[PDB]
Symmetry: D3
Subunit: 155 residues, 6 copies
């Protein structure tokens, strides 16, 4: 069960909160895949290639994390990796009922596939991606919110 | 009262959750109108015609159910049908304060018009149209979440 | 479904919000039973006998409304009345997920039994028995929040 | 803290609930600035020019209120005004975790800045701009929802 | 309106989050009454008198704050103080709807009486009295959650 | 983190939802401690010693599960076991903000301690102990809600 975990998200862009989830889940799983979803339907600020790149940069220090981009269904991805656990992060503005709904839906698509939830550090519990984007977009400084190593990309 | 209720939605597509609500509310009113709102402001995956046709098939065997598409205010639709009851379904990811707000906005518009809520079966309380569309858009199989009569259409 | 609904509650005391729901739901069923549960496990300010008398006085003028006190499981009460509908009132402080949970817990005990929800008028949608008790217990005037018929008794 | 507050919003259009907050919060600070954000990401129905004008019109008779439009970060706006108070209104469908989040995001951008919350009158605690927009989109009458002096600009 | 604000609560015990609210709201009002309710029905861990002393001690450095104990209805207290503003704090576990409901109920009991909300610092937004009492009762150290000067009292 | 998890609760009585969480988290750590708290402040229907015994009986077939009763702080308990992870289950009626609060309060008391959340089967996601207690108290049958093993010890 601990062989491999998938932490999937849009990561638009990766923030300090995402990093705390990667930092702790990567302890539990021998390998942690960070799966960056295309999510074209959301309308991401940063492209799929830019978002993959930021998150690869911000996760170099984790030796067992590999980041991939993917365009299909997450449940099938997991089936490809032989993965039986999706990792999600829970924070203050988490839509908790939607997390449960998506966990059951992913399990109904792949009967092997569990969802497990982590928490970020308390300081980072109020960080969301959409605030970061709002800050960037009105040309403000969001460097206290996202890993310093991606800042020159999002600046 | 008793003589007619209207269960309005975007139904994009109709799911086993919406069918549960039709099944139950159709027991309480002589006639249940299933009303498919244009809802162009959301950006439905399926056209108004496709969504009417699908809910018509999935409701073929409910004797007292009649499906219609409409473009204007639901409050005015009710008035047209001499209807003083709107039907809504409550489920796990319902925005419950939004439901209340919509019910008082509707009564605002048509002073005789009450809102009444039913629940789906426990199995279908976690089904949402957006998860179903996310599945369908990423090539997944959503036939376990929508009535069998529509699968030839949404695939 | 059309002939009898039970609106069950502690009613400690009955409030303007509870009357709203009786008014509304009594329009939808041939008969509405207002069932006052013992609920001795809460620690009702008013006795079962007082809560029944209170709700009897405040409902005296509704033609199809009958009030009863009961001690056992509401699902068994419904069965005794050949009733397949439980009535609940949804308001601003409602614990919405607990409502669903109770609805399904009721159905698991009596497989025929559905729960249906009504709203009170907007003015009364913030009224709670808890606040009315707190007012009354701290010597304040609660008469704007409960039916006038009962005010003689709660003071 | 006593001298000035800024009530920021997209105001699309200004409704009776916004006005309540303006009335209430204008009573707590020597000067209130009503700041209309561009908010181009929310795709407003009404342009920034029209929303400024409508709020000016609706606020004309408050002695200590001035309205401004702004394109930049609200936290730098408050800096400009030597303001350490952001005013927000709390209503039934407020997403409360996200208000807290935004208050700490504003404070993480300008360290002296607090967010203070007021409530509207109870009758207006259910009004949202989203519902006004849906009403007028569907050429219904939302005149009971927005101040008389803006109605002709929105018909 | 800025003359006097009342910040009411059970304060069982006062925590760091309460003090953040007192710190900010005492900037807006020329006098801040911190009103310690008896709150019998909630079965406080600490007696009314003990709660009153802890909070008086924790708030002595705020020169325009006075703490009082009260047993009646808060809307009636505000009336005797000529106060038109109740101060409440909002945090992560706040029952938001219950705040709105009690704001309207206090308004319906006193027509001039508004409710205004503040936030604590982010580090203190997850502090609750009940978590403090849990720690105290199972004999752990909560000194990081309450003002340290009240620690020997608790 | 991979070696041990502690799933702490009042377990009053153990229900099919808790068993789901025990099944699931036991697949994620090499040992699972099911820790029965005294919780004298809650007012448990069953004594510590009954709730220990029922949970032992209900978990006797999980090979890597140990049940213990404890009176002190969970965070010290975790220390004494060289355990970095508390397991919690998330269900429909979870108070989500209070979980996150308790996770940060536990981590305040033992700086290495993480909280991880599992979901029960969808069918048991509406089961709570309080509703089981209510059924038992009112002499109804709650044997569909708690493991067969403990049913004799409940009625
Ligand atoms: C993209 C998916 C994973 C949704 O991801 P989401 O939009 O939530 O991504 P996002 O970048 O916002 O967040 C990433 C993860 O970190 C969590 N998180 C976000 N901010 C924080 C923070 N400050 N702290 C801790 N966790 C956080 C989120 O809860 C999530 O777990 C989902 O849409 C998906 O699976 N898409 C693929 C197609 C598919 O299979 N959909 C069918 C799903 S049933
Ligand atoms: C279309 C309307 C009714 C909103 O519908 P909504 O977007 O909620 O439709 P949707 O298809 O998502 O849901 C339909 C109904 O099924 C319920 N439901 C959805 N999924 C489920 C499920 N699994 N189980 C049970 N019920 C469910 C919904 O709560 C709703 O009651 C509304 O926007 C409307 O009235 N539009 C017309 C214009 C108008 O008058 N607007 C003014 C509103 S004041
Ligand atoms: C007594 C029962 C129904 C729960 O009642 P509850 O405590 O919600 O009673 P209360 O008097 O608070 O409310 C009565 C009803 O009016 C609603 N309501 C309350 N205030 C308002 C208001 N201002 N406006 C509209 N509705 C209102 C409640 O939501 C409920 O629908 C329940 O505990 C029960 O069924 N007891 C019997 C034993 C049993 O069978 N329990 C098993 C449950 S699985
Ligand atoms: C525009 C801002 C303030 C968000 O505003 P919002 O979308 O909430 O505006 P809106 O017009 O919807 O509401 C205005 C205010 O009235 C409140 N409100 C709305 N309806 C009601 C009602 N019926 N009663 C009481 N209050 C109400 C809202 O809660 C809000 O406080 C925010 O996007 C912002 O600051 N933008 C500027 C750029 C910036 O600095 N962004 C980064 C933020 S970290
Ligand atoms: C005691 C009253 C004020 C309610 O108090 P409450 O239980 O919320 O007190 P508590 O001690 O828990 O909290 C005190 C205040 O600080 C806030 N708060 C608590 N923790 C924190 C924190 N970490 N950060 C910020 N604020 C916080 C609470 O929201 C509240 O604003 C109410 O019961 C009351 O008025 N009682 C008197 C009788 C009365 O008039 N009742 C009728 C009311 S309609
Ligand atoms: C006892 C503790 C763990 C709280 O337990 P709680 O009251 O939640 O136990 P309860 O028996 O309700 O539930 C047990 C666990 O199963 C979960 N759960 C309950 N029902 C279900 C269900 N249907 N499905 C899934 N999970 C469920 C609960 O969420 C919880 O995770 C807490 O009080 C504690 O740690 N006490 C020890 C003293 C201590 O250290 N306290 C200070 C904490 S900061």
């Amino acid at each position: 069960m601990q062989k491999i975990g998938i932490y999937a998200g849009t990561f638009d862009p990766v923030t300090n909160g995402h990093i705390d989830i990667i930092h702790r889940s990567s302890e539990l799983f021998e390998k942690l895949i960070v799966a960056v979803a295309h999510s074209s339907a959301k309308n991401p600020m940063f492209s799929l290639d830019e978002r993959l790149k930021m998150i690869q940069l911000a996760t170099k220090s984790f030796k067992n994390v590999e980041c991939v981009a993917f365009e299909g269904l997450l449940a099938n991805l997991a089936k490809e990796y032989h993965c039986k656990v999706l990792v999600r992060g829970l924070r203050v503005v988490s839509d908790f009922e939607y997390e449960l709904q998506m966990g059951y839906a992913n399990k109904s698509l792949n009967h092997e596939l569990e969802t497990l939830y982590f928490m970020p550090t308390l300081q980072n519990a109020f960080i969301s991606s959409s605030i970061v984007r709002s800050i960037i977009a009105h040309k403000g400084d969001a460097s206290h919110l996202v890993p310093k190593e991606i800042y020159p990309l999002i600046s």
